[PDB]
Amino acid sequence: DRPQKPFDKFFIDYIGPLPPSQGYLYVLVVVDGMTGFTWLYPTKAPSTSATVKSLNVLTSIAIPKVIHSDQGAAFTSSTFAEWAKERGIHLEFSTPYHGKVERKNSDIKRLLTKLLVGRPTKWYDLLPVVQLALNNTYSPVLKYTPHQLLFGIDSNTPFANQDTLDLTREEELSLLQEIR
Amino acid sequence: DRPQKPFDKFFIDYIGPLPPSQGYLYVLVVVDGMTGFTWLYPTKAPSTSATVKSLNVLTSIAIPKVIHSDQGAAFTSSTFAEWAKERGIHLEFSTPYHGKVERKNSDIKRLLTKLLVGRPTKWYDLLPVVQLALNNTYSPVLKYTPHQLLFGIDSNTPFANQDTLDLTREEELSLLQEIR
Amino acid sequence: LDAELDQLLQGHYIKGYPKQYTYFLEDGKVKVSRPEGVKIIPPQSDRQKIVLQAHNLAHTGREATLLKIANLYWWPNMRKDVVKQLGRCQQCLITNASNKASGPILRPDRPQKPFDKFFIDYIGPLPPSQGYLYVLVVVDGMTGFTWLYPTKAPSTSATVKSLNVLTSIAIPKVIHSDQGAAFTSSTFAEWAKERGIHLEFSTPYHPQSQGKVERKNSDIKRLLTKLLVGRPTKWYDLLPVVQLALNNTYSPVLKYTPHQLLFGIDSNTPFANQDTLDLTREEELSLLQEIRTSLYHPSTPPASSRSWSPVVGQLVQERVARPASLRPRWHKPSTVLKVLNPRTVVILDHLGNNRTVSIDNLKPTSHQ
Amino acid sequence: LDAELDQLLQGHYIKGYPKQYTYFLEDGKVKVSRPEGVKIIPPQSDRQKIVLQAHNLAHTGREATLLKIANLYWWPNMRKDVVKQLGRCQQCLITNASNKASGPILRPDRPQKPFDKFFIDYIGPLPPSQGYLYVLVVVDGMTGFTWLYPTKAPSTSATVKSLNVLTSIAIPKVIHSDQGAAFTSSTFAEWAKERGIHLEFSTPYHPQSQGKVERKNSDIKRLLTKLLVGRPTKWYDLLPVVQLALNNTYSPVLKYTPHQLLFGIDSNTPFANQDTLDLTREEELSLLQEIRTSLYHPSTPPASSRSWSPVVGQLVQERVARPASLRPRWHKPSTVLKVLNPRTVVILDHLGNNRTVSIDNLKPTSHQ
DNA sequence: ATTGTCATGGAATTTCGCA
DNA sequence: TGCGAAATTCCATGACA
DNA sequence: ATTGTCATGGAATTTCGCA
DNA sequence: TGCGAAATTCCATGACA
Ligand SMILES: CCN1C[C@H](C)n2c(c(O)c3c(=O)n(Cc4ccc(F)c(Cl)c4)nc(C(=O)NC)c32)C1=O
Ligand SMILES: CCN1C[C@H](C)n2c(c(O)c3c(=O)n(Cc4ccc(F)c(Cl)c4)nc(C(=O)NC)c32)C1=O
Ligand SMILES: [Mg+2]
Ligand SMILES: [Mg+2]
Ligand SMILES: [Mg+2]
Ligand SMILES: [Mg+2]
Ligand SMILES: [Mg+2]
Ligand SMILES: [Mg+2]
Ligand SMILES: [N+]
Ligand SMILES: [N+]
Ligand SMILES: [Zn+2]
Ligand SMILES: [Zn+2]
């Protein structure tokens, strides 16, 4: 067996609906398995079409050997399958209804949730800093950040301020207000 | 004493009024003394102004040391004198009321007169061929044509057909008709 | 094909496949253990499609194509198959740049006499002056003596008006021009024939061929520029001044002014030369003929190390003259019919017309 | 003056006037019998006006001026007086061409790491596609890896939108550009500062300084051209294709694709390289660091035989950037303050501002 | 069927003036 | 028959849409 | 205050395959 | 230990408004 590598497997998934930001409602999350690198793309819908536009941008930078998703409608569509086949990408689905990637995905949700309070509407502008944070975050399991693993160098934006990521009593109270 | 040279003396004079050709009535005749070369310029008037426009063209090609004319109004004007002085040309007038040049001038009149019958109105167009004829005409006194003397070479248009230059009985009769 | 790779697997020798490596079967594909690693030997009838796929990724040339292919495959003489494709890629052949220089320029003999050859050309559009926009520039080949005429348009009609005035002085044997509309019109051709003047044209889009007049245009603009510094650009009134100034300026290499070469004596202009004041005109004209034959003549320079030379029957490509955005800079290949001289050729274009053309507007089609 | 020429006439010796010739008076003018003929010796206080009159005929340089003067006059050291005037003719100094080449180009060190330096530049306008007219091109200096963004305008606003997307991946230390309006706006400068990116600008009108990106623009247009042959020029949809194609193309001199230099491993693209399939990522990243430090570096070429080099305090002239018709191609003289390196200088212009400038846009003012 | 050219000013080389 | 300096010649550089 | 670059295909040079 | 031919390297040429 060969050691795991960048571009071996991209894990994709949707987050939303979110409070509309610049007419966008979802975030397509793309995470490289081996490095834990994250790419985020805002969409208007979890449709095959929006997935296809967004991945088209990413795969003009790097192409994964395999994409892995749950059985979301967008990903199980025959259009998406033709798309992947064109590009020589094998598609992989987890079975319906059931740690590196999973911890990453959890951080993304938790980090968004933290920043879309007091400003549930300005997230579109924040996506680039969200990614830089995610990608320059120390990995407990491996010595390195994802940036380090993907490029083989130190980054120019190190996030030394590993934050709380937890909601304070103010944020807690007025996140309960936003849905009341 | 130095041998005579091109540009030593230009002999200038007017011919006209002529039958209007393209709104022109006169011909300014310029003849180099030494070579017998001829330059012709059509004017609307024997005025200092038309003389000045025309010579301005010629003296942008060569400048004579001396211009010689009769005491025509155009040539004795103080404007024309200022013009000549600017250019460092000495002006020379024959006295009022009285052979190389003279024979040349005579040919010009005789040659025009010959060609402005049957077509007293198309002379403007003819000026260039008139000059080529004059300038590539054998000189009895010297071995050479004026072209030869001015440029030191044979010309590409030799006028082997030295013509009659005299009026036939037809031309004679219908030159008498034109002024009747 | 699959025939040849059967022989190879059992241990036979085939020409081109070095016997000293281990050739095996794996996943239904023939492989070989090469110093760089294991590579697949595709069947011969597969090889074209592989080279094409590699080339088409970015339309790469020989080595960039080879390096992709060599990532997965080995066979005998890969670059031969690489080159064979590159020479058949229409897009590559008409888009890529040349990388071979033309041969060294010719230096034609100076015309022997004033009026043997005139070179003529337009300058402009310049800024409007007295409602004129262009200059007609006429340069006698032997002397350098130059006539200047302002025009509103680089038109035959204006050219004819102008030359009618100049030819009053003398008729030239030949007039040489570039292929601008004014000079190639039949109205012009008639005018020339009327007077037994022969028209000679440059190869298209090659102003060097008219080098004498083109080089005079530079001096004309240079003097006009100096004279106009800090004033509005009203040049019309200055044309005659420039004409006279230049015709009476010395060429340091020749030690003569165009005027001197034309007339053999200065006219009444500043700093006129007095050296022949005591000779007769006849003696002066005699010394002039001597000066005219003994002028400096430059010799053709050394060839660059990677110049090419046209051979009859060779595939060559004309440079596109006014390439639009994102369009190839070279026409389709064509064939050298005649080699008029080492810098000029006649080509049959594919259409197929005969085109007389400058080697500088050709490149030799790569990969035969 | 008239004092000195009195001494000379009676037969004394004066410095510079060779004693061995016969100096006489005639028409109230001092003359001398020179091998070429009799020439007038103007008084010293006459000599300037004479040189000026000669020069002004056609604004001629040294020898063409001298040859006119020598037609009538002789004095001692004429060319010294000739040169003295030429160096004071404002029109000549700002119109004439240079005839000295710049020193040989520098080859700066490759940036050491991806994201150390970005070079960026606009291409266009191209023909409209999907209502876009330009490309923003970003090229990482170490890898050659390139990002392409279509824009409707070469504007800051579009540049900021584009870099906001790219900087999602990584923030670069420095971004290098030319002085186009989009990159020199303060809106841009703020954007850069916000993120601790340092802006670096080329000397004006010197695209060589950005050679990496400029050279990528060529490949971008070349591939777009090949792909569009015989179709309408709808390029917008092809931009991502071109991006991926180029980033995965081998440089034959380097033997690596920009992608390889950036990632150390090919992604799932045709003919991907398999050589590190058995190394761990850690081993792969280690070998990548080795490759990155040992890439070919070109060395500065030999100097041309007539190059010049800027010295502090020297008079030099900036090239005019967009000279109008019949206007000089050079600005007024100015002074070299600092020599940043043999190809870049700071000049004090006469106004007098400090201008950082490329030696290629300078000529050294002639005749001191 | 046609084809580079030549002003320019430092540097290199030759000539001059004098002995 | 040789020196220093002035004159002349050499020639790369660049621009003619 | 900043700085040329590099794909390309014949030609030149080195290496390979075999003895 | 040297041959012929294939591979690889060299590098001038040209184009990036
Ligand atoms: C339309 C017919 N026509 C064709 C082309 C347009 N053309 C015409 C011209 O007069 C010139 C011209 O003067 N120069 C300037 C130039 C450049 C380099 C040199 F070496 C030299 Cl001796 C001169 N260039 C071109 C040209 O070919 N540009 C691409 C040109 C012409 O009239
Ligand atoms: C307005 C700010 N601005 C200034 C100038 C206009 N500029 C800008 C560019 O991007 C380029 C450009 O790409 N090229 C092409 C070129 C030519 C020769 C070379 F060696 C390389 Cl490396 C590139 N030329 C110019 C230019 O200076 N033309 C005279 C240019 C720019 O944006
Ligand atoms: Mg999901
Ligand atoms: Mg009279
Ligand atoms: Mg033309
Ligand atoms: Mg032209
Ligand atoms: Mg630019
Ligand atoms: Mg550019
Ligand atoms: N010739
Ligand atoms: N450097
Ligand atoms: Zn191709
Ligand atoms: Zn001047």
3-state secondary structure D45-93: HHHHHHHHHHHHCCCCCHHHHHHHHCCCECCCCHHHHHHHHHCCCHHHH
Q: How far apart are CA C150 and CA B151, in angstroms?
A: 26
Does residue C233 lie within any of the structural domains?
yes
Does residue D111 lie within any of the structural domains?
no
**What are the structure tokens assigned to D209, written together?**
């300084």
Q: How far is CA D91 from the centre of its chain?
A: 23
Nearest alpha carbon to residue A69 among A38, A35, A31: A31
Q: How far is CA D247 from the centre of its chain?
A: 29
| Nucleotide closest in space to C258 (CA vs C1') | E6
How many helices (H) and strands (E) would you count in chain D? 12, 13
Q: Which ligand is nearest to the CA of C206?
A: 1
Ramachandran angles phi, psi of C18, nearest 5°:
-50, 120
Report whether the peptide linkage leading into residue B17 is cis, meaning its omega lies within 30 degrees of zero.
yes
Q: How far apart are CA D325 and CA B127, in angstroms?
A: 37
Nearest alpha carbon to residue C78 among C28, C22, C40: C40
CB-CB contact of B156 with C112 (8 Å) = no
Q: How far apart are CA D220 and CA D126, in angstroms?
A: 12
Q: How far apart are CA B21 and CA B69, in angstroms?
A: 25
Residue pointed to by tokens 């699959």: C2
Is C178 annotated in some ligand binding site?
A: yes
Same domain, D280 and D226: no
Angle formed at CA D59 by CA D304 and CA C208, multiple of 5 degrees: 55
CB-CB contact of D202 with D177 (8 Å) = yes
Q: How far is CA D105 from the centre of its chain?
A: 10
Burial of D174 (0-12, 13-18, 19+ CB in 10 A): middle
Nearest alpha carbon to residue D212 among D274, D150, D139: D139
| Nucleotide closest in space to D99 (CA vs C1') | F13
Collapse the DSSP code of D133 into the 3-class scheme (helix H, G, I; strand E, B; otherwise coil) and give the result: coil
Instruction: Locate the DSSP E strands across chain C.
Output: 23-26, 29-34, 37-40, 117-123, 134-140, 146-151, 174-177, 198-201, 315-319, 330-341, 344-348, 354-358, 362-364
Q: How far apart are CA B139 and CA B130, in angstroms?
A: 16
How many helices (H) and strands (E) would you count in chain B? 7, 5
Ramachandran angles phi, psi of C266, nearest 5°:
-65, 150
Q: How far is D184 from chain A (nearest CA, A)?
A: 23
CB-CB contact of D166 with D145 (8 Å) = no
Amino acid at C359: I
Closest residue (Cα, C1') to E6: C215
Contacts 24+ apart (CB under 8 A), C278-282: C278/B2, C278/B3, C279/B3, C280/B3, C281/B3, C281/B4, C281/B5, C281/B6, C281/B34, C281/B35, C281/B149
Amino acid at D176: H
Chains that touch C (3 or more CB pairs under 8 A): B, D
**What are the structure tokens assigned to D142, written together?**
């170490």
C340 CA, E1 C1': Å apart: 9
Instruction: Locate the DSSP E strands across A9-168.
Output: 10-15, 26-32, 38-43, 66-69, 90-93
CB contact under 8 A, B156 and C263: no
Does residue C53 sit at the D interface (CB-CB below 8 Å)?
Answer: yes
What technique was this entry resolved by? X-ray
Nearest alpha carbon to residue C120 among C240, C200, C196: C200
CATH of the domain at D329: 2.30.30.140
**What are the structure tokens assigned to D101, written together?**
């080449």
**What are the structure tokens assigned to D22, written together?**
């016969």
Instruction: Locate the DSSP E strands across C231-352.
Output: 315-319, 330-341, 344-348
**What are the structure tokens assigned to D219, written together?**
């490949």
Q: How far apart are CA A46 and CA A75, in angstroms?
A: 9
User: What is the signed CA dihedral for B92, B98, B104, B109, rounded to 10 degrees?
Assistant: 120
Same domain, D219 and D127: yes
Q: Which of D102, D178, D179, D185 to mutate to test the pocket of ligand 2 (most atoms within 8 A of CB)?
A: D178
CB-CB contact of A64 with A88 (8 Å) = no
Same domain, D183 and D276: no
Nearest alpha carbon to residue D365 among D334, D329, D344: D334
Burial of D86 (0-12, 13-18, 19+ CB in 10 A): buried
Q: How far is CA B107 from the centre of its chain?
A: 10
Q: How far apart are CA C40 and CA C70, in angstroms?
A: 10
Cβ neighbors of C32 (< 8 A, separation 6 or more) are C21, C22, C23, C24, C38, C39, C41, C74
Q: How far apart are CA D243 and CA A58, in angstroms?
A: 11
**What are the structure tokens assigned to C49, written together?**
């499609």
Collapse the DSSP code of C63 into the 3-class scheme (helix H, G, I; strand E, B; otherwise coil) and give the result: helix
Q: Please count the CA atoms within 13 angstroms of the CA of C94 that sit on its side-chain side.
A: 19
Q: How far is A169 from chain D (nearest CA, A)?
A: 30
Q: Which of D171, D267, D284 sits opposite A7 (nearest CB)?
A: D267
Nearest alpha carbon to residue A67 among A34, A38, A32: A32
CATH of the domain at B77: 3.30.420.10
Collapse the DSSP code of C317 into the 3-class scheme (helix H, G, I; strand E, B; otherwise coil) and give the result: strand
CB-CB contact of D273 with D79 (8 Å) = no
CB-CB contact of A1 with A74 (8 Å) = no
A131 CA, E19 C1': Å apart: 91
CATH of the domain at C84: 1.10.340.70
Name the strand (E) or helix (H) holding A23: none
Nearest alpha carbon to residue C249 among C116, C123, C146, C110: C146
> How many residues does the structure list for chain A?
180
Domain coverage including residue A94:
1-180
Task: Tell me the pairing of strands C134-140 and C146-151.
Answer: antiparallel
Q: How many CB atoms lie within 10 A of CB D76?
A: 13
Q: How far apart are CA D66 and CA D60, in angstroms?
A: 9
Nearest alpha carbon to residue D136 among D107, D105, D163, D109: D163
Q: How far apart are CA B122 and CA D264, in angstroms?
A: 87
Does residue C276 lie within any of the structural domains?
yes
DSSP per-residue letters across C144-212: --EEEEEESSS-HHHHHHHHHHHTTT---SEEEE-S-HHHHSHHHHHHHHHTTPEEEEPPTT-GGGGHH
DSSP D359: G
Task: Tell me the pairing of strands D174-177 and D198-201.
Answer: parallel
Nearest alpha carbon to residue A34 among A12, A59, A55, A8: A8
Closest residue (Cα, C1') to G1: D356
Domain count, chain B: 1
Q: Which of D166, D268, D279 is the best substitution to test chain A (most A C-beta atoms within 10 A)?
A: D268
Does residue D16 lie within any of the structural domains?
yes
* Cβ within 7 A of any strand H atom: C 63, 66, 70, 76-80, 97-102, 304-307, 329; D 122-123, 154, 180, 207, 211, 214-215, 217-218, 221, 252-253, 255
CATH of the domain at D275: 6.10.20.110
Q: How many CB atoms lie within 10 A of CB D252?
A: 14
Same domain, C245 and C120: yes
Q: How far apart are CA B98 and CA D180, in angstroms?
A: 78
Angle formed at CA C297 by CA C294 and CA C299, multiple of 5 degrees: 150
Name the strand (E) or helix (H) holding A103: helix A100-115
Cβ neighbors of C66 (< 8 A, separation 6 or more) are C78, C79, C82
**What are the structure tokens assigned to D159, written together?**
């540049």
Residue pointed to by tokens 């000293």: C20
Instruction: Locate the DSSP E strands across B70-129.
Output: 90-93
**What are the structure tokens assigned to D10, written together?**
């009676």
Asked if strand G comes closer than 7 Å to C66 Cβ, the answer is no
C77: left (phi over 0), alpha (psi -120 to 50) or beta: left
Does residue C272 lie within any of the structural domains?
yes
Q: How far is the CA of C241 from the centre of ligand 1 (A)?
A: 25
Amino acid at C244: L
DSSP C251: B
Q: How far is the CA of C324 from the centre of ligand 6 (A)?
A: 22
Helix/strand/coil percentages in chain C, nearest 5: 35, 20, 45
Does residue C110 lie within any of the structural domains?
no
Q: What is the resolution of this structure in A?
A: 2.7
Q: Is the CB of C106 under 6 A from ligand 9?
A: no
Domain count, chain D: 4
Nearest alpha carbon to residue C138 among C172, C179, C111: C172
Domain coverage including residue D19:
5-97
Collapse the DSSP code of C285 into the 3-class scheme (helix H, G, I; strand E, B; otherwise coil) and give the result: helix
Q: Which of C164, C172, C278 sits opposite B156 (nearest CB)?
A: C172
Give the residues across from C39 on adjacent strands. Answer: C32
Which nucleotides of strand F lie within 7 A of protein CB?
6-17
Does residue C315 lie within any of the structural domains?
yes
Same domain, D238 and D316: no
CB-CB contact of A136 with A157 (8 Å) = yes
Q: Please count the CA atoms within 13 angstroms of the CA of D186 that sit on its side-chain side.
A: 0
**What are the structure tokens assigned to C98, written together?**
């040349």
Q: How far is the CA of C122 from the centre of ligand 1 (A)?
A: 10
Does residue D110 lie within any of the structural domains?
no
Q: How far is A120 from chain D (nearest CA, A)?
A: 20
CB-CB contact of D147 with D166 (8 Å) = yes
Q: Which of D71, D235, D255 sits opposite C271 (nearest CB)?
A: D71
Amino acid at A5: K
Q: How far apart are CA A133 and CA D13, in angstroms?
A: 92
Q: How far is the CA of D155 from the centre of ligand 8 (A)?
A: 14
Give the residues across from C344 on adjacent strands. Answer: C341, C358
Ramachandran angles phi, psi of C51, nearest 5°:
-65, -40
Is D121 annotated in some ligand binding site?
A: no
Q: How far apart are CA B167 and CA C194, in angstroms?
A: 27
Q: Is the CB of C211 under 6 A from ligand 1?
A: yes
Amino acid at B15: I
SS (H, E, C) D226-280: HHHCCCCCCCHHHHHHHHHHHHCCCECCCCECHHHHHHCCCCCCCCCCCCCCCCC
Q: Which of A39, A60, A88 sits opposite D240 (nearest CB)?
A: A60
Residue pointed to by tokens 């010197």: D206
Cβ within 7 Å of strand G: which of C 156-215?
none
Q: Is the CB of C121 under 6 A from ligand 1?
A: yes
Q: How far is the CA of C192 from the centre of ligand 6 (A)?
A: 21
Same domain, C273 and C357: no
Q: How many CB atoms lie within 10 A of CB A144?
A: 18
Give the residues across from B43 on adjacent strands. Answer: B26
Instruction: Locate the DSSP E strands across chain A.
Output: 10-15, 26-32, 38-43, 66-69, 90-93
Burial of C31 (0-12, 13-18, 19+ CB in 10 A): middle
